[PDB]
Ligand binder design. Structure first.
Ligand SMILES: Nc1ncnc2c1ncn2[C@@H]1O[C@H](COP(=O)(O)OP(=O)(O)NP(=O)(O)O)[C@@H](O)[C@H]1O
Ligand SMILES: Nc1ncnc2c1ncn2[C@@H]1O[C@H](COP(=O)(O)OP(=O)(O)NP(=O)(O)O)[C@@H](O)[C@H]1O
Ligand SMILES: [Mg+2]
Ligand SMILES: [Mg+2]
Lengths: 253, 385, 79, 394, 71, 47, 129, 49
């Protein structure tokens, strides 16, 4: 008796066409919220009756109906490409003794990475403040990659490989500004090690040139690390870069 | 000390009282709507209803019609229907449309956008003046051009010469250019708008000039004013894709800024400060030379400059007071204040390796040698013949 | 000293409360224009609303042919 | 409550207040309600105004002598302002005079013969609808053949809405006689009529006339269930209930459950549950255990008739088991299933003291909150006003 | 026995919806085990019901997916 | 009381409860500072 | 004549609200200057919700809050205030406000001339205004 | 006989060649009118370059 109800009930749910997904930008004084419907433009559209405007906050991703666009339920988990990337990459199982030798580098790297996350206060007291990041370079085949992943196990953070330009992403909007948007997403999804691999061998002509919109998008990201200082003060976002050579890298770094 | 306490006691009788007053006053006996509201309300709903499509207002034609663009691609010759008067509207504003029939049912949005958020800064900057140590003379050049005419145009009138307008800050990383601009503005206590250039350029078509025009409008209203456009050098002659494009949208945004610079209204009472590497990164076009007037070439710190800048840094490193301020200056090689930042960081870096429990006189001295060594190593010996 | 030291801690909880209560002030009330002598406008507005002569799309002639070829801004062509 | 919350211009609301209140003041004359709710009263229109005059007769039940006197200005002759007044007074008279005196039946009998022509005039259709319910009530259990003949002439005229009233009116007058000639004519006519209201009326009348008719209704039940019309099957179901009343019969009960499972249409499934409550009226012990299954039914209609059947069975002394089945039903989303649970609940605990039973307390306070919500549909509040009205009526 | 026939018929109904015509989309990430978010071929982000007894082990890794067109 | 009588009663308390605390507190402080469900029917006779 | 009694009752009440703050911040401690400035703005809003009529009387005394108390800051905060009080009824708020605004002129008062003339140009709502 | 139109509605439609409109008159990259509901080649249009 109970089983047949469930089968029927599912069918009745599916009927509803569309159904969408926005993000509350702000709350307004007539008891409506300005939603950015994520593929579409902006719309100003009321809250559901059930939830009051006090419950909602700035930048809350929400679900939406499609027959009136009135809000449905708040999303339990933020919709962002970054989340999916973590899933795939998986929790680091690599450890220091996977790679033997190169002993100097192994000891050293614990100091640079492990401590600003775990004890930001201790790393500051003995030393001063915190890094702006770490750039890894050396012979390919050193297993620099294997070192970054090994530390990441012991640190116990979300090791999200973002390899390459995010012009590859084209899921919603242009991929250009998704580069820039990385800061925002890393903050929400902390603790995070952003492992920015990108050799910057997309053209030597624009490494040495003034030309290059790839260079511009790259640049706007670097500035966010020092304007917003979200990552610096409460360190839990390490900005780990890796390039094959120190000398083919963009000179704003 | 004592005075702080006073302020806390006053707050704990102020906020508690306030909360209770609100409840009684707004509603209960008095009533929150008191009849008049109820009337406006019934009318408003009719004219409205959800959803409501936010809009962008292109031009007003006095005849109760307007030309609007919505999210959707075609434009609309729409009627204004009641609410906001034509006067109280500003073209270039984001406006409220009723979705079924697109008519201007009001305004409340007022360029609801992150750009507006970043640009506005009504208070004066965090930097107070010549806290910064050295390049005194340099900073007392930027004050002659900017500050001095806003505080007193009298002197300029009496000479028979237009006040200078504009300065262009140019040169080199490490001299804390950006900082000097904030410093001069604070003294003036000019409403000091600030914006990043990267925001004004984007892939999407025609949004760029809207934003750019707006900067100029906001500034003129709130004159006396300073507009600090940071990372104008960003835009340059970067051209997304060298097959084609970057010669359409980018070009259009540059144009707008300049067309409003002198403007249809006289904004000589809007100074501009452009922080940039060089004007040769940009396609040169900065219009009216005497309208950007004096240009400021940053020299790097010299010997006397870096004493003062040093003094701040060494106070952070624990017990480095032991090593006389002067003799620290002497023993190292002449370097820029930036390289002091590198050196100060080197002291703490060495203290971390050592597990030096408290920073010492021995650390600060060791720090000099490793920092100086880094810079020489990095240099390439091509051999002076 | 100590009786007013612990007020610092207390005040901040109270400031928080004022911030959430902002939204409470603003209510469900209109903050939009539509009152005064423009409340006379809304009775008339209602009648004009039912009238259909607006919105109309903006198009433009690209060829006069002895009809007209319009080109719409969504890039649709019509005679 | 009625004036403050429930709006009088809206017709569905006004019916709910009129019915709840009619009962509140029933069994003694009261004009208190007219006076209190006077502005409210002027708002009325259409069928809200018919119910407004008929409300008066529910109130004025008993005090037989002064029953006619109060209704005096509203009768035809003395009223021709409004046809809803003219018609709803005759229904109204018949309420007071339900099962009482036959001096009243006589008067109404005259009015029927006058209008048994064209009911095509607009006033006449309304008038004659009330007259027809009216005279049936007045003549209850008389077995006056004169009445029965009069309401045949309305049927054959094929009056739009009065055809239904007439058909019902026959079965109320000739209550429990199982006169075969009456049975034959009704059953046959119901096929011819294509309009559903007239058809429903005759289906249900066939059941009424076979009250306590026992195993001599068996001829009828086979035809009605086998009839291909859903309408006759719906009335078929209540033939069994009324004949086989009181003593459970095992035959009767198997038949009812079998029909409910097998017969797909949704009104018809509803008719069997309500119907079971009659057969097992004095043996209502095992009844919740049966209808336990029937609550869970997807069908909204089956859940409704489930709520009512329980109502009907234990309408006397309160039984705690029924209250449990009825709690989920109140919170079931379908609106009318809500309305069913509320009505059903107050019947079970009729006039039990609140102090004596804590449950009585919680249940009233739920009806009042519903009306306070505007979020709860028109129907749901319709249910709530009426139901409270039962709890503390007269 | 009566409820067995309903059950059986109830599954048949769902098969029509499951059947062609269909449209391809790409399952993104979950928001919840039994409700997820997808992107269509048409760039539209739809929050959609995960019908009962379907793939889960692999569904959550960004993977290509079908969507009933009208639902 | 039914729904009508309740609505007045409830709003009526709420005004007074807020209004007392909004004034009483500030004045006062500175004034100074300066079952048998089963139980059938008792077997006792009653008239 | 009967009317006068009510009207008075109100108008003084409005004024006295602002006066007690003024007497505190100016006579007593400099700490309270900041606490009454912070309290004042939220107190206009309360009165605006409670009465349309109450708002107008309080607005005038509000610009006088500045001059009588002698706030720390004669630069930023008056200018900000005055922009809001163009929209509102009364412009006698401006006359009291200005005596505080004097400062070192042609900074504050460079803004002042620029604001007033623009808004008069803007909407000639009255010659009186 | 058959026609591939690429519409100005940004769609691509394979339509039965209307027999009234001659196979001769038609050619590749003729500009043509097309009925707005049901897509059929309604008429021919002076070409624009
Ligand atoms: N220390 C090591 N011991 C054993 N095998 C190693 C070691 N380092 C690297 N390898 C192997 O060599 C392969 C190539 O090295 P890779 O992992 O690409 O290194 P990398 O130095 O991070 N490179 P790149 O980022 O391209 O400059 C690995 O996939 C391992 O199989
Ligand atoms: N007179 C000065 N004012 C400010 N900072 C100075 C001064 N002289 C030297 N400095 C040093 O420069 C540091 C800050 O410079 P910085 O912010 O890196 O540069 P910029 O010239 O604005 N360049 P960019 O990195 O291209 O934005 C200070 O922390 C000092 O160590
Ligand atoms: Mg690698
Ligand atoms: Mg800088």
């Amino acid at each position: 008796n109970d089983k047949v109800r469930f089968i029927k009930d599912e069918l009745r749910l599916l009927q509803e066409p569309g159904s969408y997904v926005g993000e509350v930008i702000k709350i307004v004084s007539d008891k409506k919220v300005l939603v950015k419907v994520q593929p579409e433009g902006k719309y100003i559209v009321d809250v559901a009756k059930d939830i009051n405007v006090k419950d909602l906050k700035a930048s809350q991703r929400v679900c939406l109906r499609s027959d009136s666009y009135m809000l449905h339920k708040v999303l339990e988990n933020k919709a962002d490409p970054l989340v999916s990337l973590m899933m795939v990459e998986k929790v680091p199982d690599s450890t220091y003794d996977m790679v033997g030798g190169l002993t100097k580098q192994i000891k050293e790297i614990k100091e640079v990475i492990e401590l600003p996350v775990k004890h930001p206060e201790l790393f500051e007291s003995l030393g001063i403040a915190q890094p702006k990041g770490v750039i890894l370079y050396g012979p390919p085949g050193t297993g620099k990659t294997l070192l970054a992943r090994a530390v990441a196990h012991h640190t116990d953070c979300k090791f999200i490989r973002v390899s390459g330009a995010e012009l590859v992403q084209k899921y919603i909007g242009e991929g250009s500004r998704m580069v820039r948007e990385l800061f925002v997403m890393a903050r929400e999804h902390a603790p995070s090690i952003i492992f920015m691999d990108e050799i910057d061998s997309i053209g030597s002509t624009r490494v040495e040139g003034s030309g290059g919109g790839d260079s511009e998008v790259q640049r706007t990201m670097l500035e966010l690390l020092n304007q917003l200082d979200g990552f610096e003060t409460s360190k839990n976002i390490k900005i780990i870069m890796a390039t094959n050579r120190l000398d083919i890298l963009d000179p704003a770094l | 000390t004592r005075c702080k306490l006073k302020l806390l006691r006053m707050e704990r009788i102020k906020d508690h009282l306030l909360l209770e007053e609100e409840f009684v006053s707004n509603s209960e006996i008095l009533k929150p709507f008191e009849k008049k509201q109820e009337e406006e309300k019934k009318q408003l709903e009719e004219i409205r209803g959800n959803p409501l499509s936010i809009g962008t207002l292109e031009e007003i034609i006095d005849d109760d019609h307007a030309i609007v663009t919505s999210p959707t691609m075609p434009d609309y010759y729409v009627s204004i229907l009641s609410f906001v008067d034509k006067e109280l509207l500003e073209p270039g504003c984001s406006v409220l449309l009723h979705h079924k029939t697109m008519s201007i049912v009001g305004v409340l949005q007022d360029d609801a956008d992150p750009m507006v958020s970043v640009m506005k800064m009504d208070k004066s900057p965090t930097e107070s003046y010549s806290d910064i140590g050295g390049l005194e003379s340099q900073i007392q050049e930027i004050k002659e051009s900017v500050e001095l005419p806003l505080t007193h145009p009298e002197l300029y009138e009496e000479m028979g010469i237009k006040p200078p307008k504009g300065v262009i800050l140019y040169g080199a990383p490490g001299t804390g250019k950006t900082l000097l601009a904030k410093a001069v503005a604070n003294q003036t206590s000019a409403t000091f708008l600030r914006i990043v250039g990267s925001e004004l350029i984007q892939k999407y078509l025609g949004d760029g000039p809207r934003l750019c025009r707006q900067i100029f409008k906001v500034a003129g209203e709130n004159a006396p004013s300073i507009v600090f456009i940071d990372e104008i050098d960003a835009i340059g002659t970067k051209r997304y894709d060298s097959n084609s494009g970057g010669e359409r949208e980018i070009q259009r945004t540059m144009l707008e800024l300049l067309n409003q610079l002198d403007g249809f209204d006289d904004r000589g009472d809007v100074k501009v400060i452009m922080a940039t590497n060089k004007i040769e990164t940009l396609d040169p076009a900065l219009i009216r030379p005497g309208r950007i007037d004096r240009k400021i070439l940053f020299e790097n710190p010299d010997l006397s400059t870096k004493k003062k800048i040093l003094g701040i840094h060494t106070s952070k490193m624990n017990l480095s007071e032991d090593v006389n301020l002067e003799t620290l200056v002497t023993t190292k090689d002449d370097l820029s204040g930036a390289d002091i930042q590198a050196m100060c960081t080197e002291a703490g870096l060495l203290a971390l390796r050592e597990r030096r429990m408290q920073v010492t006189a021995e650390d600060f001295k060791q720090a000099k040698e490793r920092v100086m060594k880094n810079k020489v190593e990095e240099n390439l010996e091509g051999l002076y013949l | 000293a100590a009786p007013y030291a612990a007020k610092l801690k207390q005040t901040e909880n109270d400031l928080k409360d004022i911030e959430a209560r902002i939204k409470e002030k603003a209510g469900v009330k209109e903050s939009d224009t539509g009152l005064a002598p423009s409340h006379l406008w809304d009775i008339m507005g209602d009648r004009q609303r039912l009238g259909e002569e607006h919105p109309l799309q903006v198009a433009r002639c690209t060829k006069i042919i002895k009809k007209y070829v319009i080109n719409l801004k969504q890039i649709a062509k019509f005679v | 409550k009625s004036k403050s919350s429930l709006d009088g211009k809206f017709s569905l609301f006004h019916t709910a207040v009129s019915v709840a209140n009619g009962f509140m003041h029933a069994g003694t004359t009261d004009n208190s309600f007219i006076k209190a709710n006077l502005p409210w009263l002027g708002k009325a229109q259409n069928w809200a105004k018919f119910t407004a005059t008929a409300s008066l007769g529910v109130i004025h039940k008993g005090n037989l002598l002064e029953g006619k006197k109060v209704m005096a200005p509203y009768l035809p002759g003395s009223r021709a302002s409004s046809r809803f007044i003219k018609g709803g007074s005759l229904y109204g008279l018949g309420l007071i005079y339900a099962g009482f005196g036959r001096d009243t039946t006589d008067y109404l009998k005259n009015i029927i013969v006058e209008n048994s022509g064209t009911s095509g005039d607009e006033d006449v259709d309304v008038l004659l609808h009330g007259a027809s319910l009216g005279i049936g009530l007045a003549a209850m259990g008389s077995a006056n053949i004169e009445v029965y003949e009069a309401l045949k002439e309305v049927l054959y005229n094929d009056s739009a809405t009065s055809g239904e009233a007439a058909a019902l009116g026959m079965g109320l007058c000739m209550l429990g006689t199982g006169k075969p000639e009456a049975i034959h004519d009704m059953f046959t006519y119901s096929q011819e009529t294509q309009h559903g209201n007239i058809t429903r009326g005759l289906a249900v009348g066939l059941a009424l006339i076979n009250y306590g008719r026992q195993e001599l209704a068996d001829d009828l039940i086979t035809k009605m269930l086998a009839s291909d019309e859903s309408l006759l099957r719906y009335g078929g179901a209540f033939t069994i209930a009324l004949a086989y009343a009181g003593t459970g019969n095992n035959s009767a009960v198997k038949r009812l459950l079998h029909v409910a499972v097998s017969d797909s249409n949704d009104d018809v499934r509803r008719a069997a549950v309500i119907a079971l409550g009659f057969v097992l009226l004095r043996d209502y012990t095992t009844v919740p255990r049966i209808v336990q299954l029937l609550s869970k039914s997807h069908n909204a209609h089956v859940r409704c008739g489930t709520a009512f059947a329980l109502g009907i069975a234990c309408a006397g002394k309160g039984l705690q088991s029924a209250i449990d089945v009825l709690d989920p039903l109140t919170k079931d989303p379908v609106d009318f299933v809500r309305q069913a649970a509320m009505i059903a609940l107050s019947m079970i605990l009729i006039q039990q003291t609140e102090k004596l039973n804590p449950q009585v307390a919680d249940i009233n306070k739920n009806f009042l909150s519903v009306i306070t919500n505007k979020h709860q549909e028109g129907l749901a509040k319709f249910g709530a006003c009426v139901a409270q009205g039962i709890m503390n009526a007269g | 026995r009566h409820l067995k026939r309903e059950l059986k018929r109830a599954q048949e109904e769902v098969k029509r919806i499951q059947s062609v015509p269909l449209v391809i989309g790409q399952f993104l990430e979950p928001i919840d085990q039994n409700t997820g978010i997808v992107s269509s071929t048409t760039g539209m982000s739809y929050v959609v019901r995960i019908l009962s007894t379907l793939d889960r082990e692999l569904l959550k890794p960004s993977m290509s997916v079908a969507l009933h067109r009208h639902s | 009381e039914e729904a009508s009588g309740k609505e007045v009663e409830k709003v009526a308390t709420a005004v007074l409860s807020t209004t007392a605390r909004a004034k009483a507190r500030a004045k006062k402080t500175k004034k100074e500072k300066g079952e048998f469900y089963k139980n059938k029917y008792s077997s006792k006779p009653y008239k | 004549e009967i009317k006068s009694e009510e009207k008075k009752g109100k108008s003084s009440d409005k004024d006295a609200t602002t006066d007690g703050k003024n007497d505190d911040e100016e006579e007593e401690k400099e700490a309270g200057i900041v606490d009454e400035l912070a309290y004042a703005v939220l107190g206009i809003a309360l009165i605006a919700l409670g009465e349309d009529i109450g708002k107008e009387m309080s607005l005038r005394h509000f610009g006088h809050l500045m001059h009588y108390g002698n706030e720390h800051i004669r630069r930023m905060v008056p200018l900000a205030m005055g922009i809001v009080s163009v929209s509102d009824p009364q412009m006698k708020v401006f006359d009291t406000l200005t005596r505080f605004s004097h400062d070192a002129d042609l900074e504050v008062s460079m803004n002042s001339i620029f604001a007033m003339g623009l808004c008069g140009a803007g909407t000639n709502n009255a010659r009186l205004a | 006989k058959a026609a591939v139109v690429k519409t100005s509605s940004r769609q691509t439609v394979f339509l039965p060649m209307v027999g009234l409109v001659d196979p001769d008159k038609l050619k590749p990259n003729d500009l043509v009118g097309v009925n707005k509901d049901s897509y059929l080649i309604l008429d021919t249009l002076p070409s624009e370059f």
